[PDB]
Design a protein around this ligand. Structure first.
Ligand SMILES: COCCNC(=O)N1CCN(C(=O)c2cccs2)CC1
Length: 121
């Protein structure tokens, strides 16, 4: 299954599955500072799923590993901001992270396999 470009549409599909999840509700767009005045005291590099989709659709990811690093940053930002491990929004992040990781694993494997096949000779 050696298509080097297949990851992109697979990532567009998994973003659609994430935008149909109620658990993505907090992570679709940026944190408003009026609501969270200290957010940028704690979080150096904001990230949200609309920004990930924009970066993909513009052609500014070279690999699904780059997309995966930004999605992971959405979840580490929630872990760094939460004042408790049992907050609503951090709890939503952990379920959404599990869903993401379950679905991205074959996208990554298939892409890495395709590059190795390309380089074989
Ligand atoms: C509806 O969503 C609006 C945009 N998102 C947003 O305001 N936030 C998600 C990122 N945040 C967090 O993960 C945490 C908050 C409380 C604990 S963690 C901080 C608030």
């Amino acid at each position: 299954s050696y298509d080097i470009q297949a990851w992109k549409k697979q990532c567009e599909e998994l973003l659609n599955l994430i935008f149909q999840c109620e658990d993505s509700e907090p992570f679709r767009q940026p944190v408003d500072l009026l609501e969270y005045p200290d957010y940028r005291d704690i979080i150096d590099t904001p990230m949200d799923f609309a920004t990930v989709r924009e970066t993909l659709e513009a052609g500014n990811y070279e690999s699904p590993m780059e997309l995966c690093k930004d999605v992971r940053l959405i979840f580490s930002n929630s872990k760094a901001y939460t004042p408790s491990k049992r907050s609503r929004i951090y709890s939503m992040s952990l379920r959404l992270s599990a869903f993401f990781e379950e679905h991205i694993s074959s996208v990554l494997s298939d892409y890495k396999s395709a590059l190795r096949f390309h380089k074989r000779n």
